């Protein structure tokens, strides 16, 4: 599969996170176009989502600079087709 550009995979969603907060933060990094959060067949979430930009933003230098990978974390990644 192909490594989709200005998109990140967020795993690690909480519950009590909803769009707007993850739109929120992620406007840190850059004009946000779509947030996904996966959900299953009942629309409750997997615990997983997408969060793509509408200008070219650096997707693997943000998810490099990840150092804490405890279990509360979103575990940002590429986003491979």
Request: net charge positive.
């Amino acid at each position: 599969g192909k490594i989709m550009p200005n998109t990140v995979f967020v795993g690690g969603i909480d519950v009590r996170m909803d769009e707007t907060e993850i739109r929120s933060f992620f406007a840190r990094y850059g004009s946000v176009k779509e947030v996904k959060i996966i959900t299953d067949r009942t629309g409750v979430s997997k615990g997983y989502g997408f969060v793509s930009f509408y200008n070219d933003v650096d997707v693997q230098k943000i998810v490099e600079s990840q150092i804490n990978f405890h279990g509360k974390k979103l575990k940002l990644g590429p986003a491979i087709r």
